[PDB]
Amino acid sequence: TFAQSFPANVSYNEYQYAIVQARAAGFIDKVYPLTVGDKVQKGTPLLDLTIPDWVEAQSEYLLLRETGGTATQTEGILERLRLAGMPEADIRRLIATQKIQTRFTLKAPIDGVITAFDLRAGMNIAKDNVVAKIQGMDPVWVTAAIPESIAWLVKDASQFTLTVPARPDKTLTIRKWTLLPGVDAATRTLQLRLEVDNADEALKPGMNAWLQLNTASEPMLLIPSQALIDTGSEQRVITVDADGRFVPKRVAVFQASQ
Amino acid sequence: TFAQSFPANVSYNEYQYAIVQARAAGFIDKVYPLTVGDKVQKGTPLLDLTIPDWVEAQSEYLLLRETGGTATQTEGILERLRLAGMPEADIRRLIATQKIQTRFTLKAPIDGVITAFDLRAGMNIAKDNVVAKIQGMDPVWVTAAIPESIAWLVKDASQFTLTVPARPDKTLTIRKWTLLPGVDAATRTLQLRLEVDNADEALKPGMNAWLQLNTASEPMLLIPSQALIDTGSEQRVITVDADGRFVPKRVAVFQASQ
Amino acid sequence: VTSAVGGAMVGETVEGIARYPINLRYPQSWRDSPQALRQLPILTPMKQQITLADVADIKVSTGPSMLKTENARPTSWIYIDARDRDMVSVVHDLQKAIAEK
Amino acid sequence: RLAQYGISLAEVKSALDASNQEAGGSSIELAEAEYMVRASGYLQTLDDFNHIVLKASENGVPVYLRDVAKVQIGPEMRRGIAELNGEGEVAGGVVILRSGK
Amino acid sequence: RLAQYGISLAEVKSALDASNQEAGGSSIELAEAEYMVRASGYLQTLDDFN
Numbered sequence: 001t002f003a004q005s006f007p008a009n010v011s012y013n014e015y016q017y018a019i020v021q022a023r024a025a026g027f028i029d030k031v032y033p034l035t036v037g038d039k040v041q042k043g044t045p046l047l048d049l050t051i052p053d054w055v056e057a058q059s060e061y062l063l064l065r066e067t068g069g070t071a072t073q074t075e076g077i078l079e080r081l082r083l084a085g086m087p088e089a090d091i092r093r094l095i096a097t098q099k100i101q102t103r104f105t106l107k108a109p110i111d112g113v114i115t116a117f118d119l120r121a122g123m124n125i126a127k128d129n130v131v132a133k134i135q136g137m138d139p140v141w142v143t144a145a146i147p148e149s150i151a152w153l154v155k156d157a158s159q160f161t162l163t164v165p166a167r168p169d170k171t172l173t174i175r176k177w178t179l180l181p182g183v184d185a186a187t188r189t190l191q192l193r194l195e196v197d198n199a200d201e202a203l204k205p206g207m208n209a210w211l212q213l214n215t216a217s218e219p220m221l222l223i224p225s226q227a228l229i230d231t232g233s234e235q236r237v238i239t240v241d242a243d244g245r246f247v248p249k250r251v252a253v254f255q256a257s258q
Numbered sequence: 259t260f261a262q263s264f265p266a267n268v269s270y271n272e273y274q275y276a277i278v279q280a281r282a283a284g285f286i287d288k289v290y291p292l293t294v295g296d297k298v299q300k301g302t303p304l305l306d307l308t309i310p311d312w313v314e315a316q317s318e319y320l321l322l323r324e325t326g327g328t329a330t331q332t333e334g335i336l337e338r339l340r341l342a343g344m345p346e347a348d349i350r351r352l353i354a355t356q357k358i359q360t361r362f363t364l365k366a367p368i369d370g371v372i373t374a375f376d377l378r379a380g381m382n383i384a385k386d387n388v389v390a391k392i393q394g395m396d397p398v399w400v401t402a403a404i405p406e407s408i409a410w411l412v413k414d415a416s417q418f419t420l421t422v423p424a425r426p427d428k429t430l431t432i433r434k435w436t437l438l439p440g441v442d443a444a445t446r447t448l449q450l451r452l453e454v455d456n457a458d459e460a461l462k463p464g465m466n467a468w469l470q471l472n473t474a475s476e477p478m479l480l481i482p483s484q485a486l487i488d489t490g491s492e493q494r495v496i497t498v499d500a501d502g503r504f505v506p507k508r509v510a511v512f513q514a515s516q
Numbered sequence: 517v518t519s520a521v522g523g524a525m526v527g528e529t530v531e532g533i534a535r536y537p538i539n540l541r542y543p544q545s546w547r548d549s550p551q552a553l554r555q556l557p558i559l560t561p562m563k564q565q566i567t568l569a570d571v572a573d574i575k576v577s578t579g580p581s582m583l584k585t586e587n588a589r590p591t592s593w594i595y596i597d598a599r600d601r602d603m604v605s606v607v608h609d610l611q612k613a614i615a616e617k
Numbered sequence: 618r619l620a621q622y623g624i625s626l627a628e629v630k631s632a633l634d635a636s637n638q639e640a641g642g643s644s645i646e647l648a649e650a651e652y653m654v655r656a657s658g659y660l661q662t663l664d665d666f667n668h669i670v671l672k673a674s675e676n677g678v679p680v681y682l683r684d685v686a687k688v689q690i691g692p693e694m695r696r697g698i699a700e701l702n703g704e705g706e707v708a709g710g711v712v713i714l715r716s717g718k
Numbered sequence: 719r720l721a722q723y724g725i726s727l728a729e730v731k732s733a734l735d736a737s738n739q740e741a742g743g744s745s746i747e748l749a750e751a752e753y754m755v756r757a758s759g760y761l762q763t764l765d766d767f768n
Contacts, residue, residue: 004555005491007565007597007620009443027281027343035272037449039439054343102341113439120275124343124385137439145620147567150555166409166448168512188564204448207406207443208621214487225549229749256551265678403678445678446621466677467521484690517757519626522744523694526630529638529660537693538637538660540630540686547746553755559619559626575751694744 001216002257006155008144008194010164010207016136019116020046022125023085024053029103031121032067034132036114044108046132049125051104054086058100065098112136113205124215137205139175140198144211154179159214162196166207173197192245220254228253259474259516264450265403266467271453274336274394276367277374278304281343282311287361292390294375299329302366304375304390307383309362312344316358321400323356370394371463395463398456403447406452407513410476412437412448419470420452425460432469475515483514520556521547550574618685624671632682636660636669663688737761 030048034040061077080172081091090101116133119125142162146154162172173196180191192211196203203209229236231255266437287306292298319335339349348359377383400420404412421429435452442449450469454461461467485495488511497507518524519540527538541547546556556568568574584591598606619626642654643674660666667683699709720727743755761767 003491007618009621031275035274035275037438037440037451050341055341120277122276122278124279124281126386145565147557147565147570149567149570166406169410186563188566201439202409204406204409204439204441206443207409208446208618226749229751230550230576232575238262256549265676267676351629403676405700442678444623445672445676445680446684449676488543490545492545517743517755518741519630521755522743524742526633527660529637531661538633540626540633547743549746549748557620559624563620563623571649572757598668612755 002153002217002255004115004150004213004257006144006146006192006211006213008142008162008192008209008211010203010205010209011141011143012113012115012135012137012205013139013195014135016110016112016138018112018132018134019130020106020109020132020134021130022049022051022106022127023087024051024161025124025126026051026122027054028119028121031119033039034114035116037116037118038110039112040114040132041111042108046106046108047119048103048105050102052102054081054084055100055102057081057084057093061094062098062100070104106131108132110134110136111138135205137201137203138198139195140203140205142194142196142203142209142211144192144194144209145184145187146192148183148188150188151190153215154190155215157216160194161212161214162194162209163212164203164207164209166204167202170202172227181234217255221251225256260408261472261516262470264402264404264469264471266400266420266426266469268461268463268465269399269401270371270373270393270395270463271397271399274368274370274397274491276370276390277388278364278367278390278392280307280309280364280383280385281345282309283382283384283478284309284311286379289377289379292372292375294372297370298366298372298390299369300366304364304366305377306361308360310360312339312342313358313360315339315342316352317481319352320356320358320384328369330475334438364389366390366392368392368394369396380507384468393463395459395461396456398454398461398463400452400454400461400467400469402450402452402467403445404471405448405470406441406448407448409448410513412450412471413472416474418450418452420454420467421470422461422465422467424462424465428460430454444464478512488512521553550576622672622680622685624680624685628671629682629685632669636665663690686705737766 009245026049028047028049032045032047034044034046040046057077057080060079064073064077070175078095081094083240085102087104090104093099094101112134113136115135117128118129119131120232126130151231160174162174164170164172175195175197177192177194180193183190194211223237227237228251229238234250236248236250237254239247241247284307285306289305290303292302292304295306313499315335315338319332319339322332322335336349336353340346344359345362347364352359370392371394372390373393374388376387377389381390402418416433418432418435419429420432432452435450438449438451440449441447452469481495487496487506488507491506493511494506494508497505499505519526520542523539523541525537525539527536529538542556546552553574554567554569557569558566558568560566584593596606596610619629634718637660638658640656640658641702642656644654645652666688667681669682670679671682672680698705701707720730727742737759738761739759741759743757745755746753
């Protein structure tokens, strides 16, 4: 069983990625006590903005509701609102209050950490501005770096174990691991990505993590290491005889560890 | 037992943040005696600009007033104005004076420091230009960088002691603070942010500060560090038994201190 | 090799009249064996993470253990222990066995 | 940790060298007396070792030697071993006499 | 060639100095024997210079 330790980073879960953008132009009415580095939860208000893009069609819908328009004429107009950007929840508010919607609130689509917040009170907002970048850390990610020359060390049956210097009181469970298709050209290392349970959020992105791998080789004759003599041109062990007689024997070394 | 002093910095309150942008394109008429670095208070004039976007609709409203249009026709043209971005205060000047407003005046929305000021005299103005970036520091922000290694301890910390070199009389005990979700990667450090009243303006963004932590851990099994025989992967200690015989034991180490 | 693997002294703390050695070294687990040395972690100047085998071959060999010299000529000393007999008889008996065999 | 903190062995060695000396600032005349300007700097505590600076951000957050290594008190390479009565290693001393004394 | 490769004379001199020595890594204990860690590095071939 080959043992070896590798440095690893705790990073954000990239399958829990959210970048909020307004569906249409407008101006900021209010921005909530938030900033990059803050943790938000699903539903957390980000900002309030006014969007004049949907008022014409909205009012057009409301009047049909007056002049006894057909359900088809009504739905058909709600469809224009939907594929014009207006969020379904907001459209639902239009039908429930029969009032034109002008002011809207953008909320955090997911639980996570704000890594970007480019809009502050007093600004106008555009379709390409990011109001909030939100990255989650529950099934937190841990990426380990293995030098390219030791690629052989990691097999499918390899047994992994993770520890974080910041949390010695924490035994972490690995959800799954993957050996990424390519190597980081910058560091000349293979990337091994691990998904770890982090419900208590003890593992913070940016933290250090030590990855220990255990890998099993093909069956070979096994002896202790102090039992092997190596003079560079020959390897030998000292065998004990049935009589107690100490007899030397030549051997071929395959590999060694631990 | 722990007695440590963490590096810390004084920064702007990011919940007191304002970026002033015009609501429509125009040209600058005059800019007031201000620049980046200057301290401004809410209401302070930033610049005077001309904006032709809303004049066609203002005419529409004034014409409506001359010919006694419906009350709901007027509320309508007024609503299209505010949706067009024209400030509610400026709309009031419209009705009160019964004359089209073309010259406006942008003012500071909050108390703070101008950290950006991108518009000077003789310039055109766009909606994506920032006339003023204003940040407040009355409730001042101090962030401390704490070595990740003791996340297990600071998570349950009771109080810290805040001191600033430039102000030996503004040293106070800190009982409220938030331990951010992410840790800096360049320096593997936790980020602890606290808020400090700063009415006197004694604490300035950019100043250095120190965050002191004097505390003890929960009771654990203790031994002298000298006693730990640790290879890179195998740590043990030599226990002395009853008869005085040496017997190496395997141990699992939590962490050491002092 | 001299610091990571070997424990070469790097400095000395001053403590009154006394002096004590300071050194730098990897934990033993990294330098346990030849195979261990072949995986000796190295952080390159460009922050590339490699092993020692990536820049060197490590081979076990045999050679000089200690070079005894007498008048600038290599020499090996054979230590003989005879205490029952008298010296001269033993040396003369050695001189024979050696000359003949 | 060297990789995690992006610090090379060479950088560690250099930092060490710059953290174990004293310096003199000549002297200054106060009340017609001579005040010798003496600057500390001698490594004399484990903490002193731990707080060897390796790197510093614009923020003013430093990376210390304690970040990439553990500083311990250990034995130096023994070049001589003494044993007494076959029941323990000991520290001894020998008195050497001048040649014709 | 110094100009074409953007390498100063001083840099050449420094490189040379770091390419002609041997180093010791102390010793390692295998089979109760002492294995001396010896690192090559002596300039001894024209190719080595190259």
